[PDB]
């Protein structure tokens, strides 16, 4: 919901990026927060092998 | 080979028609067309070809996914000479029931215990931490 | 290389030299009813259309006679 | 134009292809030929008409009356010119363009509506000129020429939607959206039928309802009908005009095929022989049949041939090839089996397929990021 | 259509009590055509028109009698509609036997 | 102008499997004119009429059969019945001796089960060969892997998709290095 | 009841309402049961009951599906609805992102 809540603005970003291309006015990066979201999402991947070990032996 | 050299002789179109019938697999048309070959002396070689493809035709018709009855093998198979039921009893090595051909070991494999694919999934996770975090 | 497209375009010039604006107008007789229409649906509508072009095109008027006979 | 010559000259489709109904269309076409300067239209379509015995009689009078009224509009245009005024010249050139739409020549009406299109002091009269090109674009069945002036005249209105101007533009959206096969976005256009009225310019109100009952009856499912039309009182008002529509709505919503197939022949014959609705007659039939088969097959998992044959009132030999063609061609549900001569489907389209609906966008997005890899370094 | 043409010459003229019959029957024919918004609009117009003029119980009770059917058509609240049929029964009381038996029939219905 | 060859041969080798996707999402007036002579036969593949379409091919066939050696079309002339019997595999299970045999232009008991068995030995379909009273049945279970060994089903899908998307992650890591290399 | 007013549809709504109460009364505890063992209590035919039931499954008021050859009743549900919606919306919204990226790069290159 936060990812889509940022993508709704990222739909409007290519217009400004398609108009000015000079200077940065928004202090939000929209990148590192999504990287952190991916880091929190990788817990499923890292613990899937843990469930594989608990189920195996 | 279609170099348009003659294109009207039966021997020029014979291998492509026999190979196209091989793609169809219909053996009745070949057996009924056995007497259609002229006095050309390669009819015995055509019989050698039938002798080297009868193992594949008979092997494919005797695949026996579930079961097949002898009353179809009487017509599909060759003459009453018991060469197929003798050689195939020592080649296939199956059970002979009351005038019927039984099919075993068909979809009888037991599924996996899900233990080994979980271990290879753990190795895949190791490769995911590797490739996702290697340069870092 | 982009240089091998020239003989293929020459073959297209030969196909265009076979019939001079004959398939553009003759096929345009149906394209005027197909223009601006989604061509993705024209594959199914043309599939069933050409499939029923031989026989039983409509078949809806015949069901009223097929009710008592079948 | 907005005159009845649009409809009278619009009956030329049923005048052309069938030879049975080509008597009344040429009756009111020849009788109406003395109206709205119909000389050039029926002279162009004279190949689909009678001989030249009586044809050359009135051509000498119409060709001189055309030049008389034309030179009177030219003299009036010269009297309106060289004088201070804006709407007077717009009315002179606009009336000349309306007469040039009566004769059916879009060359002098193209440059005329171009001149008065350039003399538009406001955007409202500009959209009026656009509509003046749409009323003849319906007869000319052009595709891009009627969407260019509406694509340019669509943006920057800023004067609010009127009761008949914006509603009329929405009616045009119903026209070109009925021409095209777009339905899921055309199902919202006829929602303003409360403000619609009898418009003799393009289509009567009963013809607008008769035309929207197909896109609404077929292009909508049961919740869409119950929400839009069944809850609305408009179809409850206009169902009393013709008792057939009520049968095609309550019988379809009631899932009674025994009467819907007996009465479907009227939809088959009425579906064709129309100006803009004929060439699409193949899509409505198949789409409605597969829509009804998905409707009945939705709430039914297994189906015997007895209840199906008695429900539809047709032989099993026809539904055999029906479902046989709708497994691969239709692609409505899972594979069907006849081991027990009973229609039995599974439809595992929710649990795993609900997650598998995104694998198509995953593969197309995979090819698109492969193109993204092609953009790398070149 | 003819009733609308009658409204065009009745809304301008005097005798507003005559408009209650044609707007009431207008709600009756829009209800017969199953039209809720226009029957509620004509009903409200008949209320704001007949609010000052003391109408006889033949026409005054018919407003609530039709109002209970209009409200009972959407099944919003049966208490208010039951009040419309109750006051309608109080209006049609002892004036007509069929109207009374259909008034109590409407009470037992709603 | 050049993709009409890879697309032409593409659909020519795609119609061999019985499912022929036509031109749907591409609108250009080159593949249309290129496909105009081939459209009647590529639409005639699915219906699968032997005697009529056999004459239709050589009737107006000039360029697609004048392309050389007529190899894949001379294989198609007998592949029509294989795509048709594959449509029968996409059809109901029970095979009749008159209705569907007469429908397939092949009315004989031996070659029916013989050629259908030649379609079974391919391995692309699934059937249950059983003989109880003489009729040939089939289970024709084409149910997808939904709730049927899913982990082993899309396991390689997850591994392969993560490999392609992960080398795409490399393809979004390295070009930034090729960006910051000069500065 | 032949001269009954338009409220006959409301009376049929009461009939179908009590029918709905009976259906949600006896079917709800019966996951899979015979159609004649459960229809014998109401001693009515399976035609109108089957049509109303299947109509209400087409209306999606509850979880269930009918049958004609075997008469087997199956009730199931799919709780995780909010996963495929958000995922599909992320795919559709990201399609415009990648396409716009190809528009900026296609614009800057060719």
mmCIF file with all atom_site columns, C-alpha atoms in Angstrom, chain F residues 59-146:
data_model
loop_
_atom_site.group_PDB
_atom_site.id
_atom_site.type_symbol
_atom_site.label_atom_id
_atom_site.label_alt_id
_atom_site.label_comp_id
_atom_site.label_asym_id
_atom_site.label_entity_id
_atom_site.label_seq_id
_atom_site.pdbx_PDB_ins_code
_atom_site.Cartn_x
_atom_site.Cartn_y
_atom_site.Cartn_z
_atom_site.occupancy
_atom_site.B_iso_or_equiv
_atom_site.pdbx_formal_charge
_atom_site.auth_seq_id
_atom_site.auth_comp_id
_atom_site.auth_asym_id
_atom_site.auth_atom_id
_atom_site.pdbx_PDB_model_num
ATOM 1  C CA . UNK F 1 59  ? -5.198  -23.951 -56.977 1.00 0.00 ? 59  UNK F CA 1
ATOM 2  C CA . UNK F 1 60  ? -3.876  -20.410 -56.455 1.00 0.00 ? 60  UNK F CA 1
ATOM 3  C CA . UNK F 1 61  ? -0.575  -21.382 -54.817 1.00 0.00 ? 61  UNK F CA 1
ATOM 4  C CA . UNK F 1 62  ? 2.206   -19.486 -56.590 1.00 0.00 ? 62  UNK F CA 1
ATOM 5  C CA . UNK F 1 63  ? 4.793   -17.998 -54.207 1.00 0.00 ? 63  UNK F CA 1
ATOM 6  C CA . UNK F 1 64  ? 4.492   -19.901 -50.918 1.00 0.00 ? 64  UNK F CA 1
ATOM 7  C CA . UNK F 1 65  ? 4.763   -23.134 -52.910 1.00 0.00 ? 65  UNK F CA 1
ATOM 8  C CA . UNK F 1 66  ? 7.219   -21.572 -55.385 1.00 0.00 ? 66  UNK F CA 1
ATOM 9  C CA . UNK F 1 67  ? 9.570   -20.734 -52.498 1.00 0.00 ? 67  UNK F CA 1
ATOM 10 C CA . UNK F 1 68  ? 11.440  -24.006 -53.009 1.00 0.00 ? 68  UNK F CA 1
ATOM 11 C CA . UNK F 1 69  ? 11.298  -27.792 -52.538 1.00 0.00 ? 69  UNK F CA 1
ATOM 12 C CA . UNK F 1 70  ? 7.796   -27.501 -50.973 1.00 0.00 ? 70  UNK F CA 1
ATOM 13 C CA . UNK F 1 71  ? 9.105   -29.326 -47.896 1.00 0.00 ? 71  UNK F CA 1
ATOM 14 C CA . UNK F 1 72  ? 7.074   -27.942 -44.997 1.00 0.00 ? 72  UNK F CA 1
ATOM 15 C CA . UNK F 1 73  ? 3.918   -27.616 -47.101 1.00 0.00 ? 73  UNK F CA 1
ATOM 16 C CA . UNK F 1 74  ? 4.277   -31.189 -48.384 1.00 0.00 ? 74  UNK F CA 1
ATOM 17 C CA . UNK F 1 75  ? 4.551   -32.126 -44.709 1.00 0.00 ? 75  UNK F CA 1
ATOM 18 C CA . UNK F 1 76  ? 1.551   -29.893 -43.973 1.00 0.00 ? 76  UNK F CA 1
ATOM 19 C CA . UNK F 1 77  ? -0.604  -31.727 -46.535 1.00 0.00 ? 77  UNK F CA 1
ATOM 20 C CA . UNK F 1 78  ? -0.502  -34.733 -44.189 1.00 0.00 ? 78  UNK F CA 1
ATOM 21 C CA . UNK F 1 79  ? -0.126  -32.606 -41.041 1.00 0.00 ? 79  UNK F CA 1
ATOM 22 C CA . UNK F 1 80  ? -3.677  -31.296 -41.546 1.00 0.00 ? 80  UNK F CA 1
ATOM 23 C CA . UNK F 1 81  ? -5.033  -34.575 -40.169 1.00 0.00 ? 81  UNK F CA 1
ATOM 24 C CA . UNK F 1 82  ? -2.589  -34.463 -37.239 1.00 0.00 ? 82  UNK F CA 1
ATOM 25 C CA . UNK F 1 83  ? -3.608  -30.937 -36.247 1.00 0.00 ? 83  UNK F CA 1
ATOM 26 C CA . UNK F 1 84  ? -7.218  -32.020 -36.727 1.00 0.00 ? 84  UNK F CA 1
ATOM 27 C CA . UNK F 1 85  ? -6.832  -35.062 -34.489 1.00 0.00 ? 85  UNK F CA 1
ATOM 28 C CA . UNK F 1 86  ? -5.049  -32.769 -32.033 1.00 0.00 ? 86  UNK F CA 1
ATOM 29 C CA . UNK F 1 87  ? -8.191  -30.635 -32.132 1.00 0.00 ? 87  UNK F CA 1
ATOM 30 C CA . UNK F 1 88  ? -9.975  -33.911 -31.372 1.00 0.00 ? 88  UNK F CA 1
ATOM 31 C CA . UNK F 1 89  ? -7.638  -34.234 -28.386 1.00 0.00 ? 89  UNK F CA 1
ATOM 32 C CA . UNK F 1 90  ? -8.855  -30.748 -27.448 1.00 0.00 ? 90  UNK F CA 1
ATOM 33 C CA . UNK F 1 91  ? -12.380 -32.122 -28.033 1.00 0.00 ? 91  UNK F CA 1
ATOM 34 C CA . UNK F 1 92  ? -14.430 -34.658 -26.074 1.00 0.00 ? 92  UNK F CA 1
ATOM 35 C CA . UNK F 1 93  ? -13.063 -38.035 -25.004 1.00 0.00 ? 93  UNK F CA 1
ATOM 36 C CA . UNK F 1 94  ? -15.306 -40.703 -26.529 1.00 0.00 ? 94  UNK F CA 1
ATOM 37 C CA . UNK F 1 95  ? -14.649 -41.433 -30.208 1.00 0.00 ? 95  UNK F CA 1
ATOM 38 C CA . UNK F 1 96  ? -17.594 -42.669 -32.269 1.00 0.00 ? 96  UNK F CA 1
ATOM 39 C CA . UNK F 1 97  ? -17.448 -44.834 -35.389 1.00 0.00 ? 97  UNK F CA 1
ATOM 40 C CA . UNK F 1 98  ? -19.818 -42.742 -37.546 1.00 0.00 ? 98  UNK F CA 1
ATOM 41 C CA . UNK F 1 99  ? -20.247 -39.222 -36.141 1.00 0.00 ? 99  UNK F CA 1
ATOM 42 C CA . UNK F 1 100 ? -16.668 -38.145 -35.424 1.00 0.00 ? 100 UNK F CA 1
ATOM 43 C CA . UNK F 1 101 ? -15.111 -40.666 -37.825 1.00 0.00 ? 101 UNK F CA 1
ATOM 44 C CA . UNK F 1 102 ? -17.297 -39.416 -40.676 1.00 0.00 ? 102 UNK F CA 1
ATOM 45 C CA . UNK F 1 103 ? -16.592 -35.879 -39.440 1.00 0.00 ? 103 UNK F CA 1
ATOM 46 C CA . UNK F 1 104 ? -12.827 -36.473 -39.683 1.00 0.00 ? 104 UNK F CA 1
ATOM 47 C CA . UNK F 1 105 ? -13.208 -37.835 -43.257 1.00 0.00 ? 105 UNK F CA 1
ATOM 48 C CA . UNK F 1 106 ? -11.912 -41.205 -41.989 1.00 0.00 ? 106 UNK F CA 1
ATOM 49 C CA . UNK F 1 107 ? -14.562 -43.935 -41.664 1.00 0.00 ? 107 UNK F CA 1
ATOM 50 C CA . UNK F 1 108 ? -12.876 -47.205 -40.656 1.00 0.00 ? 108 UNK F CA 1
ATOM 51 C CA . UNK F 1 109 ? -12.326 -48.962 -37.304 1.00 0.00 ? 109 UNK F CA 1
ATOM 52 C CA . UNK F 1 110 ? -8.665  -49.926 -37.737 1.00 0.00 ? 110 UNK F CA 1
ATOM 53 C CA . UNK F 1 111 ? -7.071  -46.667 -38.898 1.00 0.00 ? 111 UNK F CA 1
ATOM 54 C CA . UNK F 1 112 ? -9.153  -44.697 -36.379 1.00 0.00 ? 112 UNK F CA 1
ATOM 55 C CA . UNK F 1 113 ? -7.566  -46.222 -33.272 1.00 0.00 ? 113 UNK F CA 1
ATOM 56 C CA . UNK F 1 114 ? -4.329  -46.745 -35.220 1.00 0.00 ? 114 UNK F CA 1
ATOM 57 C CA . UNK F 1 115 ? -3.824  -43.082 -36.140 1.00 0.00 ? 115 UNK F CA 1
ATOM 58 C CA . UNK F 1 116 ? -5.260  -41.853 -32.828 1.00 0.00 ? 116 UNK F CA 1
ATOM 59 C CA . UNK F 1 117 ? -2.682  -44.134 -31.206 1.00 0.00 ? 117 UNK F CA 1
ATOM 60 C CA . UNK F 1 118 ? -0.079  -42.522 -33.472 1.00 0.00 ? 118 UNK F CA 1
ATOM 61 C CA . UNK F 1 119 ? -1.185  -39.252 -31.867 1.00 0.00 ? 119 UNK F CA 1
ATOM 62 C CA . UNK F 1 120 ? -0.926  -40.828 -28.400 1.00 0.00 ? 120 UNK F CA 1
ATOM 63 C CA . UNK F 1 121 ? 2.654   -42.038 -28.921 1.00 0.00 ? 121 UNK F CA 1
ATOM 64 C CA . UNK F 1 122 ? 3.740   -38.421 -29.492 1.00 0.00 ? 122 UNK F CA 1
ATOM 65 C CA . UNK F 1 123 ? 3.562   -37.580 -25.779 1.00 0.00 ? 123 UNK F CA 1
ATOM 66 C CA . UNK F 1 124 ? 2.071   -34.086 -26.136 1.00 0.00 ? 124 UNK F CA 1
ATOM 67 C CA . UNK F 1 125 ? -1.389  -35.307 -25.064 1.00 0.00 ? 125 UNK F CA 1
ATOM 68 C CA . UNK F 1 126 ? -2.768  -37.551 -22.308 1.00 0.00 ? 126 UNK F CA 1
ATOM 69 C CA . UNK F 1 127 ? -5.160  -40.449 -22.871 1.00 0.00 ? 127 UNK F CA 1
ATOM 70 C CA . UNK F 1 128 ? -6.269  -43.663 -21.157 1.00 0.00 ? 128 UNK F CA 1
ATOM 71 C CA . UNK F 1 129 ? -6.300  -46.539 -23.658 1.00 0.00 ? 129 UNK F CA 1
ATOM 72 C CA . UNK F 1 130 ? -8.989  -48.965 -22.471 1.00 0.00 ? 130 UNK F CA 1
ATOM 73 C CA . UNK F 1 131 ? -10.937 -51.625 -24.379 1.00 0.00 ? 131 UNK F CA 1
ATOM 74 C CA . UNK F 1 132 ? -14.012 -53.038 -22.622 1.00 0.00 ? 132 UNK F CA 1
ATOM 75 C CA . UNK F 1 133 ? -16.719 -53.443 -25.285 1.00 0.00 ? 133 UNK F CA 1
ATOM 76 C CA . UNK F 1 134 ? -14.779 -52.182 -28.330 1.00 0.00 ? 134 UNK F CA 1
ATOM 77 C CA . UNK F 1 135 ? -14.984 -48.413 -27.829 1.00 0.00 ? 135 UNK F CA 1
ATOM 78 C CA . UNK F 1 136 ? -11.756 -46.522 -27.141 1.00 0.00 ? 136 UNK F CA 1
ATOM 79 C CA . UNK F 1 137 ? -11.976 -44.248 -24.104 1.00 0.00 ? 137 UNK F CA 1
ATOM 80 C CA . UNK F 1 138 ? -9.617  -41.553 -22.817 1.00 0.00 ? 138 UNK F CA 1
ATOM 81 C CA . UNK F 1 139 ? -9.235  -39.585 -19.595 1.00 0.00 ? 139 UNK F CA 1
ATOM 82 C CA . UNK F 1 140 ? -7.928  -36.483 -21.464 1.00 0.00 ? 140 UNK F CA 1
ATOM 83 C CA . UNK F 1 141 ? -7.027  -34.839 -18.140 1.00 0.00 ? 141 UNK F CA 1
ATOM 84 C CA . UNK F 1 142 ? -5.668  -31.436 -19.168 1.00 0.00 ? 142 UNK F CA 1
ATOM 85 C CA . UNK F 1 143 ? -6.036  -30.013 -15.645 1.00 0.00 ? 143 UNK F CA 1
ATOM 86 C CA . UNK F 1 144 ? -3.257  -27.517 -14.912 1.00 0.00 ? 144 UNK F CA 1
ATOM 87 C CA . UNK F 1 145 ? -0.879  -27.942 -11.951 1.00 0.00 ? 145 UNK F CA 1
ATOM 88 C CA . UNK F 1 146 ? -3.208  -25.903 -9.682  1.00 0.00 ? 146 UNK F CA 1
#
